[PDB]
Amino acid sequence: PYQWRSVAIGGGGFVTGVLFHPAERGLAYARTDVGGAYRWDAQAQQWTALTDWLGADDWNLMGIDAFAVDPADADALYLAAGTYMHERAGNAAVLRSFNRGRTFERADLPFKLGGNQLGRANGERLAVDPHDGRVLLLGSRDAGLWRSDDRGAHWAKVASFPDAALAGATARNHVGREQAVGIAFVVFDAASGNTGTPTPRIYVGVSTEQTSLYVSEDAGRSWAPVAGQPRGLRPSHMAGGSDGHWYLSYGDQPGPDLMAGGALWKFTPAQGRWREISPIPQPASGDGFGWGAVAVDPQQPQVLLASTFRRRTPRDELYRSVDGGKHWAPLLADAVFDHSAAPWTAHATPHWMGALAIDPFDGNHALFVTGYGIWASRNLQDFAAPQRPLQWWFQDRGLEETVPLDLLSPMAGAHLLSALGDIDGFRHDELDRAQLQYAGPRLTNGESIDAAGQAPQWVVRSGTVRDRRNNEIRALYSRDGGKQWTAFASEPPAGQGAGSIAIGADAAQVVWAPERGGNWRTSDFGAQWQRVDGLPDTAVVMADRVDARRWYAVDVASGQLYESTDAARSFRATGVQVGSPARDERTRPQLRPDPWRAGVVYLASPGKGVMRWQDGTLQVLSQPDEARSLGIGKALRAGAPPALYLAGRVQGVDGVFRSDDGGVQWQRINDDAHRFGRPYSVTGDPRIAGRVYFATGGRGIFYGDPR
Numbered sequence: 174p175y176q177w178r179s180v181a182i183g184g185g186g187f188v189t190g191v192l193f194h195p196a197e198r199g200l201a202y203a204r205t206d207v208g209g210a211y212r213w214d215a216q217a218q219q220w221t222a223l224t225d226w227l228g229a230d231d232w233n234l235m236g237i238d239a240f241a242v243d244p245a246d247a248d249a250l251y252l253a254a255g256t257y258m259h260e261r262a263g264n265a266a267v268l269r270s271f272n273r274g275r276t277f278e279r280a281d282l283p284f285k286l287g288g289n290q291l292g293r294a295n296g297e298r299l300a301v302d303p304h305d306g307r308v309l310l311l312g313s314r315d316a317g318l319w320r321s322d323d324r325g326a327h328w329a330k331v332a333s334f335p336d337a338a339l340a341g342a343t344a345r346n347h348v349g350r351e352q353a354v355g356i357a358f359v360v361f362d363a364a365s366g367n368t369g370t371p372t373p374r375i376y377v378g379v380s381t382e383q384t385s386l387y388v389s390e391d392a393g394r395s396w397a398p399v400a401g402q403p404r405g406l407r408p409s410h411m412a413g414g415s416d417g418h419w420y421l422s423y424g425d426q427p428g429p430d431l432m433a434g435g436a437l438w439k440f441t442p443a444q445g446r447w448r449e450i451s452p453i454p455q456p457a458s459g460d461g462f463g464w465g466a467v468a469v470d471p472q473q474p475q476v477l478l479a480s481t482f483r484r485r486t487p488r489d490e491l492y493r494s495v496d497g498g499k500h501w502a503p504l505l506a507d508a509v510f511d512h513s514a515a516p517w518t519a520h521a522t523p524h525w526m527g528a529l530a531i532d533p534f535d536g537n538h539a540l541f542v543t544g545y546g547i548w549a550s551r552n553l554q555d556f557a558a559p560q561r562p563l564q565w566w567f568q569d570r571g572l573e574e575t576v577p578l579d580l581l582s583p584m585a586g587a588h589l590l591s592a593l594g595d596i597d598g599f600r601h602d603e604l605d606r607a608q609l610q611y612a613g614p615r616l617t618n619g620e621s622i623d624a625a626g627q628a629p630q631w632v633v634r635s636g637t638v639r640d641r642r643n644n645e646i647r648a649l650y651s652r653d654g655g656k657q658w659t660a661f662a663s664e665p666p667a668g669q670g671a672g673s674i675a676i677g678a679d680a681a682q683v684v685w686a687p688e689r690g691g692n693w694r695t696s697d698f699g700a701q702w703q704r705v706d707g708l709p710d711t712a713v714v715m716a717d718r719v720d721a722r723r724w725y726a727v728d729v730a731s732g733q734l735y736e737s738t739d740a741a742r743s744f745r746a747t748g749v750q751v752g753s754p755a756r757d758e759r760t761r762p763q764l765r766p767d768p769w770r771a772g773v774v775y776l777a778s779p780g781k782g783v784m785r786w787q788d789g790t791l792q793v794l795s796q797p798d799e800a801r802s803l804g805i806g807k808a809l810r811a812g813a814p815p816a817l818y819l820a821g822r823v824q825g826v827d828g829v830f831r832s833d834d835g836g837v838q839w840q841r842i843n844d845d846a847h848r849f850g851r852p853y854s855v856t857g858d859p860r861i862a863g864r865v866y867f868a869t870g871g872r873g874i875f876y877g878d879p880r
């Protein structure tokens with residue numbers, strides 16, 4: 174019923190795997206940690222998202238922990254889907270397609286996977302037997318090795334593979350939490366097999382400092398450690414093999430967090446020989462770096478690519494060898510990058526290169542992943558610097574992977590301003606063209622953003638600064654609609670940045686609630702702060718859009734509604750229960766004052782449905798099964814109530830909805846193919862009737878219009 178379009182950013186997240194199909198030129202796939210999988214469509218020159226049909230119940234399948242194609246069947250595609258292994262996350266599943274991801278069938282697995290956990294960029298854990306495509310293997314993170322003999326429709330544990338093989342296959346992430354990393358890859362040795370019969374020789378890499386490489390000679394019936402293997406580091410990839418030489422990348426951690434050592438090994442099983450072939454050595458002192466990935470040219474078995482990982486001396490490098498590891502050349506330092514597709518990438522640095530792949534039909538064409546998208550070479554074989562430099566382009570059309578944290582559609586200015594994880598955000602001058610990030614000071618996360626209802630040129634945002642060590646001020650304000658920004662003169666005396674921020678209708682007052690700090694009021698952008706009187710620290714404050722004297726608050730811990738009529742100096746408890754907010758990416762109360770009427774507020778919560786607060790009264794407008802995220806925009810007809818938009822569950826069905834009768838009746842405006850999991854930050858456009866924006870937890874921002 175609506176047409177949904179991506180807000181153009183360009184990648185923006187960590188692509189954890191890339192894969193060419195050797196049976197068809199121009200066919201490739203990508204997997205991501207938070208945002209599903211993609212098929213490169215040579216005819217449209219774009220990546221096509223393959224898992225937007227995931228509904229709200231299946232948000233955890235957006236993390237793609239592994240993927241595989243059948244070398245003998247260009248139509249087959251297999252995804253190992255599962256994002257977290259913690260208690261609130263469901264079991265994993267193999268999604269199988271026999272039309273390149275157009276449709277999927279689902280095999281539920283009895284264990285969980287780690288699509289957005291440590292080791293997510295190790296691969297590939299899922300593999301198809303290259304001589305009998307009926308057979309697949311899947312390495313789990315904490316449940317051993319699993320096998321299918323019916324093209325992934327049913328799975329059973331490989332009883333002969335010991336669970337103890339995964340001993341020590343855990344690690345701490347950046348915030349201290351232990352995670353099950355388990356198996357890093359499963360590799361068939363195709364040279365060992367013949368068409369029609371299961372491949373006899375199979376390698377299994379385990380992300381552990383103990384024995385990390387296992388091999389079977391009898392199609393998985395028995396298992397042994399590979400003789401002579403190095404120990405103490407964790408393998409992440411195993412490539413090559415067709416000429417009898419295998420290439421394995423190692424780090425001192427599973428990745429992507431915290432790598433500070435590693436190695437690159439060449440393994441020649443016929444000679445029982447192991448040779449360290451790392452392009453550059455580890456530092457004698459100070460932090461080292463890992464080898465994030467290795468790949469072999471499908472047409473040229475002695476041609477290798479290998480990436481450093483978390484090299485900060487000075488930055489990461491990608492190396493090429495054409496003689497099996499004997500000599501290497503650096504690639505990126507002398508290369509040219511085209512940022513015209515995503516201008517903001519000119520200020521990014523290639524990093525987190527945990528996956529590489531070379532086009533099996535054109536050795537000139539190689540992909541490497543970063544923590545912000547894919548780069549693609551044009552002339553990897555043919556370049557000669559400086560007159561003919563290696564050329565990289567941002568092959569990311571159709572691929573959108575940001576996790577927005579807040580969205581703003583102001584009464585004037587750009588139609589959308591975003592607050593995004595990792596890359597701060599944008600003033601979206603054009604929704605269909607990628608932009609530069611906000612001018613002025615640079616935040617890590619953009620967490621909260623707001624604009625004055627009656628003076629929309631005044632914008633404020635807050636967020637994080639990763640590895641903050643120089644007292645960076647984490648709230649910023651603009652007076653020209655987000656074109657230029659200035660930091661607040663100080664932070665309030667309590668809290669740790671981020672949180673939620675709001676600005677009154679005439680731009681004279683800002684209320685900022687830093688993380689764990691409670692609410693603080695300023696009338697001079699942080700020159701001075703006062704604690705807001707009469708609110709618990711867990712309250713979130715929103716401004717009226719019309720009357721600068723009016724503000725509102727919902728205590729997230731209790732669901733109680735508070736009200737201010739003194740420009741947010743103080744708040745009274747209204748006596749009214751509006752419900753606690755749905756847990757989302759950022760648990761935030763859904764309180765939306767009427768852009769056109771002072772003192773009219775629309776609210777939503779899972780517990781109470783959709784409500785209107787006006788004239789000291791709460792009216793329940795409707796009671797959907799779960800009202801999660803509420804937005805307000807221009808009425809479709811003049812004189813009619815403002816349009817309301819809802820992401821949630823109505824009559825057992827999840828989706829995104831619009832009400833035209835003031836929130837009493839809802840109509841579904843997306844369809845099952847465009848559910849994107851659990852959309853949030855539903856945001857109307859006060860200037861465009863029918864327009865709605867919403868965030869997704871790894872597929873970026875979308876906007877829709879009727880028809």
Ligand SMILES: OC[C@H]1O[C@@H](O)[C@H](O)[C@@H](O)[C@@H]1O[C@@H]1O[C@H](CO[C@H]2OC[C@@H](O)[C@H](O)[C@H]2O)[C@@H](O)[C@H](O)[C@H]1O
Nearest residue numbers: 185186187347429430431524525543544545595639
């Ligand atoms: O700015 C890019 C890169 O800089 C490194 O110095 C930093 O350590 C790294 O986090 C950054 O890479 C991004 O990391 C985030 C996830 O960040 C979180 O997990 C890893 C920790 O190292 C971080 O401290 C923590 O904030 C990814 O979402 C991005 O895709 C990736 O670019």
Ligand code: NA
Nearest residue numbers: 579621622623
């Ligand atoms: Na906001």
